[PDB]
Amino acid sequence: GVTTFVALYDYEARTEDDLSFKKGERLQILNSSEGDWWLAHSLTTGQTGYIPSNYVAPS
């Protein structure tokens, strides 16, 4: 199947490339190779961007 994560907290983007999301959104991780900001896609909203990885939990 598909691995997803759940947002634990709200985040409002602090850069142009960051993804804004609310607590409880379902996220898929596209790339995690650049440190503690991961490139993610929201399955909930369809938006894409960097997220702080400490804001998510495993499904």
Swiss-Prot record:
It comes from the Eukaryota. Residues 1-59 form the SH3 domain. It is found in: Cell membrane; Mitochondrion inner membrane; Endosome membrane; Nucleus. Belongs to the protein kinase superfamily. Tyr protein kinase family. SRC subfamily. Forms a complex with polyoma virus middle T antigen. Interacts with AFAP-110. Interacts with GJA1 and PXN. Non-receptor protein tyrosine kinase which is activated following engagement of many different classes of cellular receptors including immune response receptors, integrins and other adhesion receptors, receptor protein tyrosine kinases, G protein-coupled receptors as well as cytokine receptors. Participates in signaling pathways that control a diverse spectrum of biological activities including gene transcription, immune response, cell adhesion, cell cycle progression, apoptosis, migration, and transformation. This is Proto-oncogene tyrosine-protein kinase Src. It comes from Gallus gallus (Chicken). The lineage of its organism: Eukaryota, Metazoa, Chordata, Craniata, Vertebrata.
